[PDB]
Amino acid sequence: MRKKRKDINTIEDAVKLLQECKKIIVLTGAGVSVSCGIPDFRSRDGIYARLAVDFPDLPDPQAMFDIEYFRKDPRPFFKFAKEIYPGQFQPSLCHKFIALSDKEGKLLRNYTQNIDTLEQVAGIQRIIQCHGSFATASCLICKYKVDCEAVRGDIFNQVVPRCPRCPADEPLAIMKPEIVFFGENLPEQFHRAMKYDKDEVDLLIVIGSSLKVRPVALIPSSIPHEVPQILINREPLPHLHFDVELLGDCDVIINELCHRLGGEYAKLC
């Protein structure tokens, strides 16, 4: 278990670390998207309420992320996919901050739990979407891969996107966006990245996540104890020992940090 470093405490300390460290890992949760104006999709009232009147077969919001229900009726998922699809919402200040840090080469990796795909829109290249995203779509059968744009037309017109390779008389020959559905396994890319990034990171920043769900929750405990860990979240996380606790709205705190960093970061305000 990691003990909190006694020599790293202040927001000035965090600012200096942000200036000196060159291989930063940023863990982001739902907190970096709350200002983007995205309707919730994990409860009621949420998107499930509007989908209940259209698709009376949905037992719960979680069903649209279940592979078995998806095979029976993929339509309610694709109506959800249309509402959250990339390009419809603007990335928050937190995304822009991470994107700039990647442009300057200071970003080792951004591990996120979000599926809103705002990282790609923001121009962040070194991303790892642990729960997947709409970045790519893949056929359920022949595993043919296409870009996000290749299925934008169908999803927008509420037509279930079909696979061009598989036979046209094939029922389940449909392009499913690479969101990690229930039961499915984490992409191989994640574990290779985490295995070696952990021995490469010099600074860990957590932004807007409670760190209660796997596999992102396990990351802070898997990196060497000497690496500084900064928390940027609305609530403290008692089950962890962060060196710096910046508590409050993520956009507010990031804005403050950008002000203190100056340079290209200040121009983000």
């Binding site: 909190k4 790293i8 405490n9 202040t10 927001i11 609305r234 609530e235 403290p236 962060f242 060196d243 710096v244 606790e245 910046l246 508590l247 409050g248 709205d249 507010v252 705190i253 804005n255 403050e256 002000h259």
Partner: peptide, 21 residues
Amino acid sequence: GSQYLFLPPNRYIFHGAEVYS
């Protein structure tokens, strides 16, 4: 510049913070 409360040794309370008891 933003307003904040410094709680020694390492806690900062900004706008929108959710700390209770």
